[PDB]
Amino acid sequence: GSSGSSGMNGRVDYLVTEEEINLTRGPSGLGFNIVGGTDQQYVSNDSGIYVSRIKENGAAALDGRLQEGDKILSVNGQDLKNLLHQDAVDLFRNAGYAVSLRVQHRLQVQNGPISGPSSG
């Protein structure tokens, strides 16, 4: 049994870390927009929930922790999958004073040397 990638040619090396962002519910809910939903799948290869934009004077801003481009894996221990855009928004509300959002930080690693002095 053989197997191959069969994908686009290019380097995709990035370190992913799992972190839990615990924010407080504002006067209404939160201060940041999200993108998700099997129908609104921010991407064709992704259907989870991500962050499109974050308020300047919102909880997501003050806390600092939460940052745009984050993929909220689960909320308060509730995996976010096979759900619609409305399904994700709702859960965010049910959360309550304490909203736990487990996001994954994935940044492209600088794969390559650097022009400088003798590297120790």
Side-chain angles (χ1 to χ4, degrees), residues 57-99:
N57 293 304
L62 302 157
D63 276 271
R65 279 182 287 203
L66 194 85
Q67 63 174 118
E68 286 159 40
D70 277 5
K71 184 281 197 67
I72 302 150
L73 304 154
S74 316
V75 182
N76 288 304
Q78 305 179 59
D79 315 82
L80 299 160
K81 307 196 287 192
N82 305 261
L83 37 70
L84 318 154
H85 174 76
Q86 176 69 89
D87 270 53
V89 177
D90 211 66
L91 186 60
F92 280 45
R93 297 180 88 179
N94 188 51
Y97 194 90
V99 176

PDB file of all heavy atoms in Angstrom, residues 57-99:
ATOM      1  N   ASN A  57     -11.067  48.400  21.754  1.00  0.00           N
ATOM      2  CA  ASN A  57     -11.366  48.626  23.164  1.00  0.00           C
ATOM      3  C   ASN A  57     -12.226  47.498  23.725  1.00  0.00           C
ATOM      4  O   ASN A  57     -13.112  47.730  24.547  1.00  0.00           O
ATOM      5  CB  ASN A  57     -12.080  49.967  23.346  1.00  0.00           C
ATOM      6  CG  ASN A  57     -11.185  51.148  23.018  1.00  0.00           C
ATOM      7  OD1 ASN A  57     -10.108  51.303  23.592  1.00  0.00           O
ATOM      8  ND2 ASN A  57     -11.630  51.987  22.090  1.00  0.00           N
ATOM      9  N   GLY A  58     -11.958  46.277  23.275  1.00  0.00           N
ATOM     10  CA  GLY A  58     -12.716  45.130  23.744  1.00  0.00           C
ATOM     11  C   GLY A  58     -11.898  44.223  24.642  1.00  0.00           C
ATOM     12  O   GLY A  58     -10.683  44.380  24.754  1.00  0.00           O
ATOM     13  N   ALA A  59     -12.566  43.271  25.285  1.00  0.00           N
ATOM     14  CA  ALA A  59     -11.895  42.335  26.178  1.00  0.00           C
ATOM     15  C   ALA A  59     -10.732  41.644  25.473  1.00  0.00           C
ATOM     16  O   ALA A  59      -9.666  41.452  26.057  1.00  0.00           O
ATOM     17  CB  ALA A  59     -12.883  41.306  26.704  1.00  0.00           C
ATOM     18  N   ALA A  60     -10.945  41.273  24.216  1.00  0.00           N
ATOM     19  CA  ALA A  60      -9.914  40.603  23.432  1.00  0.00           C
ATOM     20  C   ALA A  60      -8.719  41.522  23.199  1.00  0.00           C
ATOM     21  O   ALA A  60      -7.627  41.062  22.866  1.00  0.00           O
ATOM     22  CB  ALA A  60     -10.485  40.130  22.104  1.00  0.00           C
ATOM     23  N   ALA A  61      -8.934  42.821  23.376  1.00  0.00           N
ATOM     24  CA  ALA A  61      -7.874  43.804  23.186  1.00  0.00           C
ATOM     25  C   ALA A  61      -7.113  44.047  24.484  1.00  0.00           C
ATOM     26  O   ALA A  61      -5.885  43.966  24.521  1.00  0.00           O
ATOM     27  CB  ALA A  61      -8.453  45.108  22.657  1.00  0.00           C
ATOM     28  N   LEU A  62      -7.849  44.349  25.548  1.00  0.00           N
ATOM     29  CA  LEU A  62      -7.243  44.605  26.850  1.00  0.00           C
ATOM     30  C   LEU A  62      -6.402  43.417  27.304  1.00  0.00           C
ATOM     31  O   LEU A  62      -5.228  43.568  27.645  1.00  0.00           O
ATOM     32  CB  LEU A  62      -8.326  44.905  27.889  1.00  0.00           C
ATOM     33  CG  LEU A  62      -9.240  46.091  27.582  1.00  0.00           C
ATOM     34  CD1 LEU A  62     -10.557  45.956  28.329  1.00  0.00           C
ATOM     35  CD2 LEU A  62      -8.553  47.401  27.941  1.00  0.00           C
ATOM     36  N   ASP A  63      -7.009  42.234  27.303  1.00  0.00           N
ATOM     37  CA  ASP A  63      -6.315  41.019  27.711  1.00  0.00           C
ATOM     38  C   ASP A  63      -5.021  40.841  26.923  1.00  0.00           C
ATOM     39  O   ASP A  63      -4.002  40.421  27.470  1.00  0.00           O
ATOM     40  CB  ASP A  63      -7.219  39.800  27.515  1.00  0.00           C
ATOM     41  CG  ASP A  63      -8.159  39.582  28.684  1.00  0.00           C
ATOM     42  OD1 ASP A  63      -7.769  38.872  29.633  1.00  0.00           O
ATOM     43  OD2 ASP A  63      -9.286  40.120  28.648  1.00  0.00           O
ATOM     44  N   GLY A  64      -5.071  41.161  25.633  1.00  0.00           N
ATOM     45  CA  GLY A  64      -3.897  41.029  24.791  1.00  0.00           C
ATOM     46  C   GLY A  64      -3.681  39.605  24.317  1.00  0.00           C
ATOM     47  O   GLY A  64      -3.370  39.373  23.149  1.00  0.00           O
ATOM     48  N   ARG A  65      -3.847  38.649  25.225  1.00  0.00           N
ATOM     49  CA  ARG A  65      -3.666  37.241  24.894  1.00  0.00           C
ATOM     50  C   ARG A  65      -4.232  36.930  23.512  1.00  0.00           C
ATOM     51  O   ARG A  65      -3.485  36.727  22.554  1.00  0.00           O
ATOM     52  CB  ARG A  65      -4.341  36.357  25.945  1.00  0.00           C
ATOM     53  CG  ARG A  65      -3.509  36.162  27.202  1.00  0.00           C
ATOM     54  CD  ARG A  65      -4.209  35.248  28.196  1.00  0.00           C
ATOM     55  NE  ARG A  65      -5.344  35.905  28.838  1.00  0.00           N
ATOM     56  CZ  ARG A  65      -5.836  35.537  30.015  1.00  0.00           C
ATOM     57  NH1 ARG A  65      -5.294  34.523  30.676  1.00  0.00           N
ATOM     58  NH2 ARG A  65      -6.872  36.184  30.535  1.00  0.00           N
ATOM     59  N   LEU A  66      -5.557  36.893  23.415  1.00  0.00           N
ATOM     60  CA  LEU A  66      -6.224  36.607  22.150  1.00  0.00           C
ATOM     61  C   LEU A  66      -5.718  37.529  21.045  1.00  0.00           C
ATOM     62  O   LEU A  66      -5.586  38.736  21.244  1.00  0.00           O
ATOM     63  CB  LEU A  66      -7.739  36.761  22.304  1.00  0.00           C
ATOM     64  CG  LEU A  66      -8.590  36.189  21.170  1.00  0.00           C
ATOM     65  CD1 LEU A  66      -8.843  34.705  21.390  1.00  0.00           C
ATOM     66  CD2 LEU A  66      -9.906  36.944  21.057  1.00  0.00           C
ATOM     67  N   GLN A  67      -5.436  36.951  19.883  1.00  0.00           N
ATOM     68  CA  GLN A  67      -4.944  37.721  18.746  1.00  0.00           C
ATOM     69  C   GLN A  67      -5.585  37.245  17.447  1.00  0.00           C
ATOM     70  O   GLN A  67      -5.922  36.069  17.305  1.00  0.00           O
ATOM     71  CB  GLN A  67      -3.422  37.611  18.648  1.00  0.00           C
ATOM     72  CG  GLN A  67      -2.930  36.193  18.403  1.00  0.00           C
ATOM     73  CD  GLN A  67      -1.436  36.130  18.153  1.00  0.00           C
ATOM     74  OE1 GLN A  67      -0.693  35.509  18.913  1.00  0.00           O
ATOM     75  NE2 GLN A  67      -0.987  36.773  17.082  1.00  0.00           N
ATOM     76  N   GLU A  68      -5.753  38.165  16.502  1.00  0.00           N
ATOM     77  CA  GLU A  68      -6.356  37.837  15.215  1.00  0.00           C
ATOM     78  C   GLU A  68      -5.623  36.674  14.553  1.00  0.00           C
ATOM     79  O   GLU A  68      -4.433  36.463  14.782  1.00  0.00           O
ATOM     80  CB  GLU A  68      -6.336  39.058  14.293  1.00  0.00           C
ATOM     81  CG  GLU A  68      -7.350  40.124  14.673  1.00  0.00           C
ATOM     82  CD  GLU A  68      -7.001  41.487  14.110  1.00  0.00           C
ATOM     83  OE1 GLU A  68      -6.546  41.553  12.949  1.00  0.00           O
ATOM     84  OE2 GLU A  68      -7.182  42.490  14.833  1.00  0.00           O
ATOM     85  N   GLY A  69      -6.346  35.919  13.729  1.00  0.00           N
ATOM     86  CA  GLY A  69      -5.750  34.787  13.046  1.00  0.00           C
ATOM     87  C   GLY A  69      -5.688  33.550  13.921  1.00  0.00           C
ATOM     88  O   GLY A  69      -5.023  32.572  13.579  1.00  0.00           O
ATOM     89  N   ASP A  70      -6.381  33.593  15.054  1.00  0.00           N
ATOM     90  CA  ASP A  70      -6.402  32.466  15.980  1.00  0.00           C
ATOM     91  C   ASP A  70      -7.537  31.506  15.643  1.00  0.00           C
ATOM     92  O   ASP A  70      -8.625  31.926  15.248  1.00  0.00           O
ATOM     93  CB  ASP A  70      -6.550  32.966  17.419  1.00  0.00           C
ATOM     94  CG  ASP A  70      -5.227  33.395  18.022  1.00  0.00           C
ATOM     95  OD1 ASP A  70      -4.216  33.401  17.290  1.00  0.00           O
ATOM     96  OD2 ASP A  70      -5.203  33.722  19.227  1.00  0.00           O
ATOM     97  N   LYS A  71      -7.276  30.212  15.799  1.00  0.00           N
ATOM     98  CA  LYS A  71      -8.274  29.189  15.511  1.00  0.00           C
ATOM     99  C   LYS A  71      -8.808  28.571  16.800  1.00  0.00           C
ATOM    100  O   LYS A  71      -8.199  27.660  17.359  1.00  0.00           O
ATOM    101  CB  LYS A  71      -7.675  28.099  14.620  1.00  0.00           C
ATOM    102  CG  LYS A  71      -8.681  27.046  14.187  1.00  0.00           C
ATOM    103  CD  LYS A  71      -8.945  26.039  15.293  1.00  0.00           C
ATOM    104  CE  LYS A  71      -9.611  24.781  14.755  1.00  0.00           C
ATOM    105  NZ  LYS A  71      -8.706  24.018  13.852  1.00  0.00           N
ATOM    106  N   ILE A  72      -9.947  29.073  17.263  1.00  0.00           N
ATOM    107  CA  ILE A  72     -10.563  28.569  18.484  1.00  0.00           C
ATOM    108  C   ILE A  72     -10.956  27.103  18.336  1.00  0.00           C
ATOM    109  O   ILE A  72     -12.026  26.785  17.816  1.00  0.00           O
ATOM    110  CB  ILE A  72     -11.810  29.387  18.866  1.00  0.00           C
ATOM    111  CG1 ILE A  72     -11.442  30.859  19.059  1.00  0.00           C
ATOM    112  CG2 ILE A  72     -12.447  28.825  20.128  1.00  0.00           C
ATOM    113  CD1 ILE A  72     -12.571  31.812  18.735  1.00  0.00           C
ATOM    114  N   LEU A  73     -10.084  26.213  18.798  1.00  0.00           N
ATOM    115  CA  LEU A  73     -10.340  24.779  18.718  1.00  0.00           C
ATOM    116  C   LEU A  73     -11.631  24.416  19.445  1.00  0.00           C
ATOM    117  O   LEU A  73     -12.585  23.935  18.834  1.00  0.00           O
ATOM    118  CB  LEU A  73      -9.169  23.997  19.316  1.00  0.00           C
ATOM    119  CG  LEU A  73      -7.794  24.280  18.709  1.00  0.00           C
ATOM    120  CD1 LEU A  73      -6.695  23.997  19.720  1.00  0.00           C
ATOM    121  CD2 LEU A  73      -7.588  23.454  17.448  1.00  0.00           C
ATOM    122  N   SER A  74     -11.655  24.651  20.753  1.00  0.00           N
ATOM    123  CA  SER A  74     -12.828  24.347  21.564  1.00  0.00           C
ATOM    124  C   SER A  74     -13.118  25.478  22.545  1.00  0.00           C
ATOM    125  O   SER A  74     -12.247  26.295  22.845  1.00  0.00           O
ATOM    126  CB  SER A  74     -12.623  23.037  22.324  1.00  0.00           C
ATOM    127  OG  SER A  74     -12.059  22.043  21.487  1.00  0.00           O
ATOM    128  N   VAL A  75     -14.351  25.521  23.041  1.00  0.00           N
ATOM    129  CA  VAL A  75     -14.757  26.552  23.990  1.00  0.00           C
ATOM    130  C   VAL A  75     -15.254  25.933  25.293  1.00  0.00           C
ATOM    131  O   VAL A  75     -16.261  25.227  25.311  1.00  0.00           O
ATOM    132  CB  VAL A  75     -15.865  27.448  23.405  1.00  0.00           C
ATOM    133  CG1 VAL A  75     -16.235  28.549  24.386  1.00  0.00           C
ATOM    134  CG2 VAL A  75     -15.424  28.035  22.072  1.00  0.00           C
ATOM    135  N   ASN A  76     -14.541  26.206  26.380  1.00  0.00           N
ATOM    136  CA  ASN A  76     -14.910  25.678  27.688  1.00  0.00           C
ATOM    137  C   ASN A  76     -14.916  24.152  27.677  1.00  0.00           C
ATOM    138  O   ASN A  76     -15.667  23.518  28.416  1.00  0.00           O
ATOM    139  CB  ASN A  76     -16.287  26.202  28.104  1.00  0.00           C
ATOM    140  CG  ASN A  76     -16.260  27.674  28.468  1.00  0.00           C
ATOM    141  OD1 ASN A  76     -15.497  28.095  29.337  1.00  0.00           O
ATOM    142  ND2 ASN A  76     -17.095  28.462  27.803  1.00  0.00           N
ATOM    143  N   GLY A  77     -14.073  23.569  26.830  1.00  0.00           N
ATOM    144  CA  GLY A  77     -13.996  22.123  26.738  1.00  0.00           C
ATOM    145  C   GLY A  77     -14.989  21.552  25.744  1.00  0.00           C
ATOM    146  O   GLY A  77     -15.245  20.348  25.735  1.00  0.00           O
ATOM    147  N   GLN A  78     -15.551  22.418  24.907  1.00  0.00           N
ATOM    148  CA  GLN A  78     -16.523  21.993  23.907  1.00  0.00           C
ATOM    149  C   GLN A  78     -15.949  22.124  22.500  1.00  0.00           C
ATOM    150  O   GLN A  78     -15.862  23.225  21.955  1.00  0.00           O
ATOM    151  CB  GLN A  78     -17.805  22.820  24.028  1.00  0.00           C
ATOM    152  CG  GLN A  78     -18.416  22.794  25.419  1.00  0.00           C
ATOM    153  CD  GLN A  78     -19.667  23.645  25.521  1.00  0.00           C
ATOM    154  OE1 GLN A  78     -20.642  23.427  24.803  1.00  0.00           O
ATOM    155  NE2 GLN A  78     -19.645  24.623  26.420  1.00  0.00           N
ATOM    156  N   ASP A  79     -15.561  20.996  21.918  1.00  0.00           N
ATOM    157  CA  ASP A  79     -14.995  20.983  20.574  1.00  0.00           C
ATOM    158  C   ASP A  79     -15.937  21.662  19.582  1.00  0.00           C
ATOM    159  O   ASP A  79     -17.138  21.386  19.563  1.00  0.00           O
ATOM    160  CB  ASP A  79     -14.714  19.548  20.127  1.00  0.00           C
ATOM    161  CG  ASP A  79     -14.038  18.728  21.209  1.00  0.00           C
ATOM    162  OD1 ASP A  79     -14.750  18.221  22.102  1.00  0.00           O
ATOM    163  OD2 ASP A  79     -12.798  18.593  21.163  1.00  0.00           O
ATOM    164  N   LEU A  80     -15.385  22.549  18.763  1.00  0.00           N
ATOM    165  CA  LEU A  80     -16.176  23.268  17.769  1.00  0.00           C
ATOM    166  C   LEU A  80     -15.988  22.662  16.383  1.00  0.00           C
ATOM    167  O   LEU A  80     -15.067  23.029  15.652  1.00  0.00           O
ATOM    168  CB  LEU A  80     -15.783  24.746  17.750  1.00  0.00           C
ATOM    169  CG  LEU A  80     -15.997  25.515  19.055  1.00  0.00           C
ATOM    170  CD1 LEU A  80     -15.142  26.773  19.079  1.00  0.00           C
ATOM    171  CD2 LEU A  80     -17.467  25.863  19.235  1.00  0.00           C
ATOM    172  N   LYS A  81     -16.869  21.735  16.023  1.00  0.00           N
ATOM    173  CA  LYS A  81     -16.805  21.080  14.723  1.00  0.00           C
ATOM    174  C   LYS A  81     -18.194  20.660  14.254  1.00  0.00           C
ATOM    175  O   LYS A  81     -19.126  20.566  15.053  1.00  0.00           O
ATOM    176  CB  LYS A  81     -15.886  19.856  14.789  1.00  0.00           C
ATOM    177  CG  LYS A  81     -14.506  20.162  15.342  1.00  0.00           C
ATOM    178  CD  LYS A  81     -13.523  19.045  15.035  1.00  0.00           C
ATOM    179  CE  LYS A  81     -13.788  17.818  15.892  1.00  0.00           C
ATOM    180  NZ  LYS A  81     -12.671  16.834  15.813  1.00  0.00           N
ATOM    181  N   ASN A  82     -18.325  20.409  12.956  1.00  0.00           N
ATOM    182  CA  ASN A  82     -19.602  19.999  12.383  1.00  0.00           C
ATOM    183  C   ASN A  82     -20.729  20.910  12.857  1.00  0.00           C
ATOM    184  O   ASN A  82     -21.820  20.444  13.193  1.00  0.00           O
ATOM    185  CB  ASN A  82     -19.911  18.548  12.758  1.00  0.00           C
ATOM    186  CG  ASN A  82     -18.794  17.599  12.370  1.00  0.00           C
ATOM    187  OD1 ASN A  82     -18.860  16.936  11.334  1.00  0.00           O
ATOM    188  ND2 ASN A  82     -17.760  17.531  13.200  1.00  0.00           N
ATOM    189  N   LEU A  83     -20.461  22.211  12.881  1.00  0.00           N
ATOM    190  CA  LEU A  83     -21.453  23.189  13.313  1.00  0.00           C
ATOM    191  C   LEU A  83     -21.531  24.354  12.332  1.00  0.00           C
ATOM    192  O   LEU A  83     -20.629  24.559  11.520  1.00  0.00           O
ATOM    193  CB  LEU A  83     -21.112  23.707  14.711  1.00  0.00           C
ATOM    194  CG  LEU A  83     -19.625  23.898  15.012  1.00  0.00           C
ATOM    195  CD1 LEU A  83     -19.070  25.077  14.228  1.00  0.00           C
ATOM    196  CD2 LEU A  83     -19.404  24.097  16.504  1.00  0.00           C
ATOM    197  N   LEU A  84     -22.616  25.118  12.415  1.00  0.00           N
ATOM    198  CA  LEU A  84     -22.812  26.266  11.536  1.00  0.00           C
ATOM    199  C   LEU A  84     -22.342  27.552  12.207  1.00  0.00           C
ATOM    200  O   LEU A  84     -22.093  27.580  13.413  1.00  0.00           O
ATOM    201  CB  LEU A  84     -24.286  26.389  11.147  1.00  0.00           C
ATOM    202  CG  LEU A  84     -25.002  25.082  10.803  1.00  0.00           C
ATOM    203  CD1 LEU A  84     -26.495  25.207  11.061  1.00  0.00           C
ATOM    204  CD2 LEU A  84     -24.740  24.696   9.354  1.00  0.00           C
ATOM    205  N   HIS A  85     -22.224  28.617  11.419  1.00  0.00           N
ATOM    206  CA  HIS A  85     -21.787  29.908  11.938  1.00  0.00           C
ATOM    207  C   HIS A  85     -22.615  30.313  13.155  1.00  0.00           C
ATOM    208  O   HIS A  85     -22.094  30.900  14.102  1.00  0.00           O
ATOM    209  CB  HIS A  85     -21.895  30.980  10.853  1.00  0.00           C
ATOM    210  CG  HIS A  85     -21.606  32.363  11.348  1.00  0.00           C
ATOM    211  ND1 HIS A  85     -20.331  32.819  11.608  1.00  0.00           N
ATOM    212  CD2 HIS A  85     -22.436  33.395  11.629  1.00  0.00           C
ATOM    213  CE1 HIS A  85     -20.389  34.069  12.029  1.00  0.00           C
ATOM    214  NE2 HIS A  85     -21.655  34.443  12.050  1.00  0.00           N
ATOM    215  N   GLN A  86     -23.905  29.996  13.118  1.00  0.00           N
ATOM    216  CA  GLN A  86     -24.804  30.328  14.217  1.00  0.00           C
ATOM    217  C   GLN A  86     -24.541  29.434  15.425  1.00  0.00           C
ATOM    218  O   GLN A  86     -24.720  29.852  16.569  1.00  0.00           O
ATOM    219  CB  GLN A  86     -26.261  30.190  13.772  1.00  0.00           C
ATOM    220  CG  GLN A  86     -27.263  30.423  14.891  1.00  0.00           C
ATOM    221  CD  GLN A  86     -27.294  31.865  15.357  1.00  0.00           C
ATOM    222  OE1 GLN A  86     -28.038  32.687  14.820  1.00  0.00           O
ATOM    223  NE2 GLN A  86     -26.484  32.181  16.360  1.00  0.00           N
ATOM    224  N   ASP A  87     -24.117  28.203  15.162  1.00  0.00           N
ATOM    225  CA  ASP A  87     -23.829  27.250  16.227  1.00  0.00           C
ATOM    226  C   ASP A  87     -22.650  27.720  17.074  1.00  0.00           C
ATOM    227  O   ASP A  87     -22.653  27.574  18.295  1.00  0.00           O
ATOM    228  CB  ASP A  87     -23.533  25.870  15.639  1.00  0.00           C
ATOM    229  CG  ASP A  87     -24.781  25.022  15.494  1.00  0.00           C
ATOM    230  OD1 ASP A  87     -25.756  25.502  14.879  1.00  0.00           O
ATOM    231  OD2 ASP A  87     -24.783  23.878  15.994  1.00  0.00           O
ATOM    232  N   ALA A  88     -21.643  28.283  16.415  1.00  0.00           N
ATOM    233  CA  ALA A  88     -20.458  28.775  17.105  1.00  0.00           C
ATOM    234  C   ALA A  88     -20.774  30.029  17.913  1.00  0.00           C
ATOM    235  O   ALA A  88     -20.366  30.156  19.068  1.00  0.00           O
ATOM    236  CB  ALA A  88     -19.343  29.055  16.109  1.00  0.00           C
ATOM    237  N   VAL A  89     -21.504  30.956  17.298  1.00  0.00           N
ATOM    238  CA  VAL A  89     -21.875  32.199  17.962  1.00  0.00           C
ATOM    239  C   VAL A  89     -22.655  31.928  19.244  1.00  0.00           C
ATOM    240  O   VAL A  89     -22.393  32.537  20.281  1.00  0.00           O
ATOM    241  CB  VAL A  89     -22.723  33.095  17.039  1.00  0.00           C
ATOM    242  CG1 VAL A  89     -23.159  34.355  17.771  1.00  0.00           C
ATOM    243  CG2 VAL A  89     -21.949  33.443  15.776  1.00  0.00           C
ATOM    244  N   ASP A  90     -23.612  31.011  19.165  1.00  0.00           N
ATOM    245  CA  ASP A  90     -24.429  30.657  20.320  1.00  0.00           C
ATOM    246  C   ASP A  90     -23.555  30.201  21.484  1.00  0.00           C
ATOM    247  O   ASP A  90     -23.586  30.790  22.565  1.00  0.00           O
ATOM    248  CB  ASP A  90     -25.423  29.555  19.950  1.00  0.00           C
ATOM    249  CG  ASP A  90     -26.709  29.644  20.746  1.00  0.00           C
ATOM    250  OD1 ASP A  90     -27.453  30.631  20.564  1.00  0.00           O
ATOM    251  OD2 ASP A  90     -26.974  28.727  21.550  1.00  0.00           O
ATOM    252  N   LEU A  91     -22.778  29.148  21.257  1.00  0.00           N
ATOM    253  CA  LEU A  91     -21.895  28.612  22.288  1.00  0.00           C
ATOM    254  C   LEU A  91     -21.127  29.732  22.983  1.00  0.00           C
ATOM    255  O   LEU A  91     -21.002  29.745  24.207  1.00  0.00           O
ATOM    256  CB  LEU A  91     -20.916  27.609  21.676  1.00  0.00           C
ATOM    257  CG  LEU A  91     -20.020  26.858  22.663  1.00  0.00           C
ATOM    258  CD1 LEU A  91     -20.862  26.062  23.648  1.00  0.00           C
ATOM    259  CD2 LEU A  91     -19.058  25.943  21.920  1.00  0.00           C
ATOM    260  N   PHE A  92     -20.615  30.669  22.193  1.00  0.00           N
ATOM    261  CA  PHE A  92     -19.859  31.793  22.732  1.00  0.00           C
ATOM    262  C   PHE A  92     -20.685  32.561  23.762  1.00  0.00           C
ATOM    263  O   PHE A  92     -20.143  33.129  24.709  1.00  0.00           O
ATOM    264  CB  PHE A  92     -19.428  32.734  21.605  1.00  0.00           C
ATOM    265  CG  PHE A  92     -18.215  32.258  20.858  1.00  0.00           C
ATOM    266  CD1 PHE A  92     -18.103  30.933  20.466  1.00  0.00           C
ATOM    267  CD2 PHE A  92     -17.187  33.134  20.548  1.00  0.00           C
ATOM    268  CE1 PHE A  92     -16.989  30.492  19.778  1.00  0.00           C
ATOM    269  CE2 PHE A  92     -16.071  32.699  19.860  1.00  0.00           C
ATOM    270  CZ  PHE A  92     -15.970  31.375  19.475  1.00  0.00           C
ATOM    271  N   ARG A  93     -21.999  32.571  23.567  1.00  0.00           N
ATOM    272  CA  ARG A  93     -22.901  33.268  24.476  1.00  0.00           C
ATOM    273  C   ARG A  93     -23.143  32.446  25.739  1.00  0.00           C
ATOM    274  O   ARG A  93     -23.052  32.961  26.853  1.00  0.00           O
ATOM    275  CB  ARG A  93     -24.233  33.560  23.783  1.00  0.00           C
ATOM    276  CG  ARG A  93     -24.107  34.497  22.591  1.00  0.00           C
ATOM    277  CD  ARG A  93     -25.457  34.762  21.945  1.00  0.00           C
ATOM    278  NE  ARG A  93     -26.142  35.899  22.556  1.00  0.00           N
ATOM    279  CZ  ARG A  93     -27.329  36.341  22.159  1.00  0.00           C
ATOM    280  NH1 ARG A  93     -27.961  35.746  21.157  1.00  0.00           N
ATOM    281  NH2 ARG A  93     -27.888  37.382  22.764  1.00  0.00           N
ATOM    282  N   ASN A  94     -23.452  31.167  25.556  1.00  0.00           N
ATOM    283  CA  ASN A  94     -23.707  30.274  26.680  1.00  0.00           C
ATOM    284  C   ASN A  94     -22.521  30.251  27.638  1.00  0.00           C
ATOM    285  O   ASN A  94     -22.681  30.017  28.836  1.00  0.00           O
ATOM    286  CB  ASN A  94     -23.999  28.858  26.178  1.00  0.00           C
ATOM    287  CG  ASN A  94     -24.468  27.936  27.287  1.00  0.00           C
ATOM    288  OD1 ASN A  94     -25.392  28.263  28.031  1.00  0.00           O
ATOM    289  ND2 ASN A  94     -23.830  26.776  27.402  1.00  0.00           N
ATOM    290  N   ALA A  95     -21.329  30.497  27.102  1.00  0.00           N
ATOM    291  CA  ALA A  95     -20.116  30.508  27.910  1.00  0.00           C
ATOM    292  C   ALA A  95     -20.379  31.108  29.287  1.00  0.00           C
ATOM    293  O   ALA A  95     -20.432  30.393  30.286  1.00  0.00           O
ATOM    294  CB  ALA A  95     -19.016  31.279  27.197  1.00  0.00           C
ATOM    295  N   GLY A  96     -20.541  32.428  29.331  1.00  0.00           N
ATOM    296  CA  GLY A  96     -20.794  33.101  30.591  1.00  0.00           C
ATOM    297  C   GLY A  96     -19.645  33.995  31.013  1.00  0.00           C
ATOM    298  O   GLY A  96     -18.686  34.181  30.262  1.00  0.00           O
ATOM    299  N   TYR A  97     -19.740  34.552  32.215  1.00  0.00           N
ATOM    300  CA  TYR A  97     -18.702  35.435  32.733  1.00  0.00           C
ATOM    301  C   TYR A  97     -17.319  34.977  32.277  1.00  0.00           C
ATOM    302  O   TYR A  97     -16.560  35.748  31.691  1.00  0.00           O
ATOM    303  CB  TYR A  97     -18.758  35.483  34.260  1.00  0.00           C
ATOM    304  CG  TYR A  97     -17.962  36.619  34.861  1.00  0.00           C
ATOM    305  CD1 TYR A  97     -18.546  37.859  35.087  1.00  0.00           C
ATOM    306  CD2 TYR A  97     -16.625  36.453  35.201  1.00  0.00           C
ATOM    307  CE1 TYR A  97     -17.823  38.900  35.635  1.00  0.00           C
ATOM    308  CE2 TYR A  97     -15.895  37.488  35.751  1.00  0.00           C
ATOM    309  CZ  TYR A  97     -16.498  38.710  35.966  1.00  0.00           C
ATOM    310  OH  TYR A  97     -15.773  39.745  36.512  1.00  0.00           O
ATOM    311  N   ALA A  98     -17.002  33.716  32.551  1.00  0.00           N
ATOM    312  CA  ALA A  98     -15.713  33.154  32.168  1.00  0.00           C
ATOM    313  C   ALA A  98     -15.815  32.396  30.848  1.00  0.00           C
ATOM    314  O   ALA A  98     -16.475  31.360  30.765  1.00  0.00           O
ATOM    315  CB  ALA A  98     -15.190  32.239  33.265  1.00  0.00           C
ATOM    316  N   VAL A  99     -15.159  32.920  29.818  1.00  0.00           N
ATOM    317  CA  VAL A  99     -15.176  32.292  28.502  1.00  0.00           C
ATOM    318  C   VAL A  99     -13.813  31.703  28.156  1.00  0.00           C
ATOM    319  O   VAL A  99     -12.860  32.434  27.888  1.00  0.00           O
ATOM    320  CB  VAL A  99     -15.582  33.296  27.406  1.00  0.00           C
ATOM    321  CG1 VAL A  99     -15.500  32.649  26.033  1.00  0.00           C
ATOM    322  CG2 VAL A  99     -16.980  33.835  27.669  1.00  0.00           C
TER     323      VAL A  99
END
